[PDB]
Structures are given as C-alpha cells and as structure tokens.
Design a binder for these strands. Structure first.
Ligand SMILES: [Ca+2]
Ligand SMILES: [Mg+2]
Ligand code: NA
Length: 327
DNA sequence: CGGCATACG
DNA sequence: CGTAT
DNA sequence: GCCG
C-alpha cells in the first residue's frame, strides 16, 4: 500500500504525522552534520513515508510493512507514541555539536565541511566568526552580515512583488522572456527561506547570455545586495518593507525552452522528491535524469519533453502536481 | 554486501 | 569548497 | 539506516 520511492506516492504539504516526521528529520539532519549521507537518507525517507499516510500513526503495529522503517526509526516512533518524546532526539537537540552545526550551516556560504572545521577549532557563535573575518570568504561575509534577515521567513506576499521586479528586468534584457515561480512556493508553501525563479524564452537559443544581462539590470536598479557566462545566480535581494526593507535570498535560473520541463521539474522539488525521482529513473528504468534532460544510455538518446506530464509518462509514473511533491 | 541524485558557480 | 531542487 |  506504500511504494518504496517518494516519487511513487502523493505527499501533501500538510499531513497527519507532523510531530513524528519532525523528530525523524532531526536525526536525518544530525546524520548529515556527521557526514553519514546514508543514514540521513533513510531518516528522510522514513519521515517522508509518514507524510504520505492518510491518517495519524497511533500504534506501533501501523509501521509494519512500511518501507524505510527498521529497528531504529521504529524505536523513535515507539518512544514518541509512548512518552511524547524520544530521548535520542532530545539529546541531539540539546547537544552543543548539533546546535552549532545548525547555526553555522544556515549561514549562506557555509556548508557542513566548513562548519565542522570551525567547530573543531573551537568556534561556537556568529560573533566568534565576526571577530575573525580574515577567515571568511566574500560570500560568507555577506551571509553573516545578512544572517538575521535571511532567518526571517519569506512570505507569499513578498513573492509577488519580487516577481514583478524580476520580470521588468528580464523583459528589458530579452523581450518575450518569461519568469516562472518554482521551488517551495510552487508546491504551495506559504513561507520559505528563499524565492526560486526559472527564466526561459519561447525561441530556442534566444536565452543564451541572458542571465548576465538580467543581473546587470537588477544591480543597476539597486536591488542586489549580493551576487557572484552562467545560468544560475544565487543572490541576496533588497525587498521593500513598510518604511524600510529586508534582505531576501533569490535564486535565478535560465534554461532553453527545450529543457524547460526538466528544469521546472528539478527546481520545483522537493529536494528529497527529486533525489528519489532520479534514483527511480536510473535504478528502475535505466534512464539518467537531471535538470537538463532524460538520457537513455542504451540508445544514446535524450527524451524530448514538452511538459512535466511528459516526463512522468516517460518514467512510467502517475503524474503528481507540485502540491503533491512535498516529500 | 553496494548503493544512496545530479548538476552549476 | 560553495550553491541549487 | 535501510533496501534489494
Ligand atoms: Ca533556492
Ligand atoms: Mg526555495
Ligand atoms: Na550554508
């Protein structure tokens, strides 16, 4: 009744096992801080299974036969069901290692490997990093300066205003180019940590060289607080606020229209959904999927797609709208 | 046991 | 190394 | 950590 890959089942944004999935995602996060990508994946997948269930898990026996629930994840759920808390989870939550790796990796420009090295050097706080700024990249300096604003959720109300200003710059850069909202907001989220936009043009090839032209125009409008030929830009934008403004993370991606369905699919996520979809494609169908296309390595051919529906059909999967990709 | 998504800046 | 879903 |  529960298929093993997240791309084989609908996952809504809100569900019936929120507390259970949040606990498993703590353990997944902690596994990632320690470099165990395998354990991170299992805990993420187990969490995702619970999101896809039609009602709350109330008894341990309801986990029988669910994929990705073994001794460890089942014991976590058991303790939560019996006592309302899981000691392992609370131990992680309280730990200096978890709290500091979380704090450091949430800086734009800082990943697990950097955070871990800083942790091993004895650093613990944002002000610890500010006092030693020669150790920081320009990207990290921007992430640290803007860290407080970037920790405030972006609201869907914010997104429409940003999309309008991006469209104006895009339209001057290349008349006829389009901007599509992707990422979590396209899956129905009401808040987010950033805004993701996908840009293309209906005439194949006209999008070449577009992103620099867009970025230069946004920068001339004074809207870019930070940014790095290219096709992806990871920016910090100045977003108007009542009597002021706040910094917001915005990602811009350009794709040729031939690849647009693949880029839309990839950038709409969720992250776990796309990993599971690419895993399914390769392992179950022998096809190689990325945000550019879908390759048959036996015929050495790429699948043409005119829509996301095409891609799901190519892969033998029932279509899922973005709102059901919240794996 | 091997495998765990796949790319660009 | 960072970033993206 | 779990699947096949
Ligand atoms: Ca993003
Ligand atoms: Mg996003
Ligand atoms: Na980071």
């Amino acid at each position: 009744w529960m298929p093993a890959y997240a791309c084989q089942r609908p996952t809504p944004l809100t569900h019936h096992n929120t507390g259970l999935s949040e606990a498993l995602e703590i353990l997944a996060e902690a596994a990632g801080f320690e470099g165990s990508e395998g354990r991170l994946l299992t805990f993420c997948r187990a969490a995702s299974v619970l999101k896809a269930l039609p009602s709350p898990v109330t008894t341990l026996s309801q986990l029988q036969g669910l994929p990705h629930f073994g001794e460890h994840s089942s014991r976590v759920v058991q303790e939560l069901l019996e006592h309302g808390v899981c000691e392992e989870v609370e131990r992680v939550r309280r730990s200096e290692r978890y709290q500091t790796m979380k704090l450091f990796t949430q800086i734009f420009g800082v990943g697990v490997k950097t955070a871990d090295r800083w942790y091993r050097e004895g650093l613990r706080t944002l002000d610890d990093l500010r006092e030693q700024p020669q150790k920081l990249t320009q990207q990290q300096k921007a992430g640290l300066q803007h860290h407080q604003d970037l920790s405030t959720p972006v609201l869907r109300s914010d997104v429409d205003a940003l999309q309008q200003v991006v469209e104006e710059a895009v339209g001057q850069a290349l008349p006829g180019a389009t901007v599509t909202l992707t990422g979590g907001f396209r899956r129905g989220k009401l808040q987010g940590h950033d805004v993701d936009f996908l840009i293309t043009h209906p005439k194949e090839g006209q999008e070449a060289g577009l992103l620099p032209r867009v970025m230069c125009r946004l920068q001339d409008q004074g809207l870019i607080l930070y940014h790095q030929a290219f096709e992806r830009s990871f920016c910090i934008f100045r977003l108007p606020q009542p009597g002021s403004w706040k910094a917001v993370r915005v990602d811009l991606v350009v794709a040729p229209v031939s690849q647009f369905p693949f880029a839309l699919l990839g950038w709409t996520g969720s992250k776990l959904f796309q990993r599971e979809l690419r895993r399914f494609s390769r392992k179950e169908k022998g096809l190689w999927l990325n945000s550019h296309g879908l390759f048959d390595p036996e015929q050495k051919t790429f699948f043409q797609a005119a829509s996301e529906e095409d891609i799901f059909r190519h892969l033998g999967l029932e279509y899922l709208p973005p709102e059901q990709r919240n794996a």
